[PDB]
């Protein structure tokens, strides 16, 4: 009985406290519901923005990259996606 937008608010709250582990769980739930077709004012792009960053803070560069690429595909002029993609691709070369 939490709406899509309620779950996004929960994940944003957790993110603002630096709780990236629970940010991921909340944002994955939001994204699941959006990808299933449910209505909301929150956009897929907004979710992928927080999700990719929290995943990165947890240390998963490959998943942060994949999420950032999806974010950019849906939001080419996004404030952060393009710059994060460049940075993440750099970190990939340290492998």
């Amino acid at each position: 009985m939490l709406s899509v937008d309620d779950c996004f608010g929960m994940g944003r709250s957790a993110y603002n406290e630096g709780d990236y582990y629970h940010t991921v769980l909340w944002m994955e739930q939001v994204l699941k519901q959006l990808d299933a077709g449910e209505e909301a004012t929150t956009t897929k792009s907004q979710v992928l923005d927080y999700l990719s960053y929290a995943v990165f803070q947890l240390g998963d560069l490959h998943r942060a990259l994949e999420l950032t690429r999806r974010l950019l595909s849906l939001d080419p002029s996004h404030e952060r996606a393009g710059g994060n993609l460049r940075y993440f691709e750099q970190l990939l070369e340290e492998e």
Binding site: R12, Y15, N16, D49, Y50, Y53, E79, R80, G83, N84, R86, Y87
Partner: peptide
């Protein structure tokens, strides 16, 4: 360039 700032509050 450095990475963008983190997502806002």
């Amino acid at each position: 360039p450095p990475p963008p700032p983190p997502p806002p509050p």
